[model samples]
Target: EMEKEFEQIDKSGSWAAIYQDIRHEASDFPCRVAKLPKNKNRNRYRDVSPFDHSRIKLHQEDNDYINASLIKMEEAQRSYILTQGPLPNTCGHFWEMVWEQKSRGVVMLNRVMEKGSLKCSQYWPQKEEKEMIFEDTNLKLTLISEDIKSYYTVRQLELENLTTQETREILHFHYTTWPDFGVPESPASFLNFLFKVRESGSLSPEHGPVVVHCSAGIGRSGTFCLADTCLLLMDKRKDPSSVDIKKVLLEMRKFRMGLIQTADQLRFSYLAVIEGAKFIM
Candidate 1:
């Protein structure tokens, strides 16, 4: 049922209708905090804002607003902190959220600059031993090591709290090949990269939620999460056809608005899920 449904959408060219249906079903949740004058600059896009109810609130900061959300997919036992790309001023708050949340990894789905536009700020130190100090949050990060693959890169970093002097290792997984508003080259490549992240156990239930960011944190961020969650469900159920991708994605939208942004992205999620099933099924 599920396998055929996945292919049927593509074969029938009904991706647009389904995508529009899901888009229409999204709730127009209030974003009071994201709209606040002080927090407005934190958002990457004017229209892409996190819902107030599910937004990540800074635990130990004076100004508790950051354009990030805590999304929980209970069925798959996964939680992701979806956030916008860090602006220069909001970079400190970005690190603060990671420290406070106790997150072990950050999945960056976009590049610093994309096609002559600033998609995300360079929030981490690119050179080893060169530390990026966030005076506002009293935290600093040093690049430990970097491994560049054909499509993605894995970087090991050391995050330290200047105030407490406590430090933790953070994994930065970057998919450099993906373009804005586009899918990866193939679902196979995406899943291979995903399993690499999974092998690190950063996405496991034991760790705090992984921080996933793109430009606005809805399109590419949401697509990665949806595919990951659905594949997990498929593995757990021991039946590739048992998972309902649309229901799962709709459930995810409760925590963050306008997830899986485009028809192409929504279609990519289904393809990724189907491709991922080949390994575990």
Candidate 2:
């Protein structure tokens, strides 16, 4: 009877329907499923079963394990960044601006480059990566002299005191040694880290905002900013609105392009929000 059905299906020019019928029957009853010999030169349905079970499982496992570890580390060690108003006559003074904010107690995360001393030797860009370079003598140096104004309780990631040229302060974060090939820490880790910093009283009330920066202040910085904004919006428990997402992302992009440059970074932001919502709910 099954052979007759299969023959009828083949004659009807509806291979998909035939496959579905076979699948339904196979799933319901205990019967020996025999394989037929391949018919040469006859077009057969493309076997996309392999694609059905894609890398989703592996990706999820990787994200879960690594992100969980990152969250754990963040819980163990609290940290944050603070920012003040914009500086004058500074082309790329994002970190200094963060320091200024820290002085005021406004804790924020920034995307800025690590000081030269704290950069990992392997990830260091070669001369070819340099697009343009110029020196500015008019650059002002307004260091945050007082630690009481605003200070990050959490450790800084790969940042050094330009004057001291010591890598010690920056080395504590271990960002240089962050695993490059394996799964990265999830966005949850970052949010928890921020929350811990805020609760630790390291940030001052008067501080304007927190600044986050990475090398170009685009990719990593953008990712952090977007993830933070999204997480905050989700926390408000307000009705989910499309405009909110657009507005938040637009603001981040206005400040810096390619903030969440890669697809993976954007996806990570979504995953973080989902996990956060789950945690809260």
Candidate 3:
């Protein structure tokens, strides 16, 4: 029921050390992180860089780059928009991108304020009855409903295009108890939240991929999509061994850089997958 039972899993929780191996392994290949000139307006900070190859591009824009990527899992048939938390300046573009992509859900792994730091912008409306307008982008966001859970919060957000008066409802799942720079407290709690999301059918093929973001959209976000994809594969195959977690992580990294930040996070991914297999299969 844990990592120890599986010797094939790498229990060493040294993410920085493992990333060094990932860096050295792909050193010869051109990473293209700096290939394209950084867009002055899109990036919130100079340090928050996006890999050119996997960065998300708006459908109909001259400069389509955003510090986000579309991570698609063909085997599991799941997709997620892995992106950084919205900045004060980029919040407009953030909603614009969500509107353009037709994303049905937003899975937020960070809070507006964390550890005396403003990690993310107040992108959504706080009060359920109030509506917030993004004047620059000509978009209006309304908080329709809010369901507070013990460990997470579920919100129904209505986004409208002010010009056309076209509206769409997007679900937001905020996991509040998550620590500043670590995985969730336990797989059971994390899996419970994940199953709540699954029950919502937001990850279904009928809807666009869910938008998942944390501070950088790599650590917690990567861990999440990995576990979900693994369990989905297992359920589809009816075999726990059907999915290779490490291989899938490498494949996902091809689309987004710096996923699953720590060795502990990697270990947790394995642990969660093991637990999820038991639940479904």
**Tens-digit per-residue lDDT, 1-281, candidate 2:** 22343346456756555334323332121111111233111111222111111101112121110000000012112222311212222222333333322332222233122333322112111233232111221112222222221323233233233544432211111122212332247645555654554454433344333433333334444555455555555555455333143345444443222344454454455555555556656
Residue-level error in angstroms, candidate 3, position 156? 0.8
| Candidate structures ordered by lDDT, highest first | 1, 3, 2
lDDT of each: 0.88, 0.33, 0.79
* Clashing residue pairs found in predicted model 3: 13-263, 15-263
Candidate order (TM-score) = 1, 3, 2
lDDT of 3 by residue, 140-206 (tens): 9999999998889999999998988999999999988787766766788788888988898889889
Candidate 3 residue-wise lDDT at 14? 54
TM-score of predicted structure 1:
0.96
Q: Clash totals for all models, in order?
A: 0, 22, 2
Q: Which candidate number has the best TM-score?
A: 1
TM-score against truth, every candidate: 0.96, 0.41, 0.88
RMSD of each: 1.3, 21.8, 3.0
**Model 1 lDDT tens row, 1-281:** 76688678778989889988888887777999889988777887888888999999997756799999999988788999999999988899999999999999999988899988998889999899678999988998999999999989999999999988999999999988886546766788778888888999899887889999988898889988998998889888855576888889889999899888888888788888888888875
Tell me the deviation in Å of residue 94 in model 2. Answer: 6.0
Which candidate do you rate higher for lDDT, 1 or 3? Answer: 1
**Model 2: ten consecutive residues of lowest lDDT:** 64-73
Poorest 10 consecutive residues by lDDT, candidate 1? 179-188
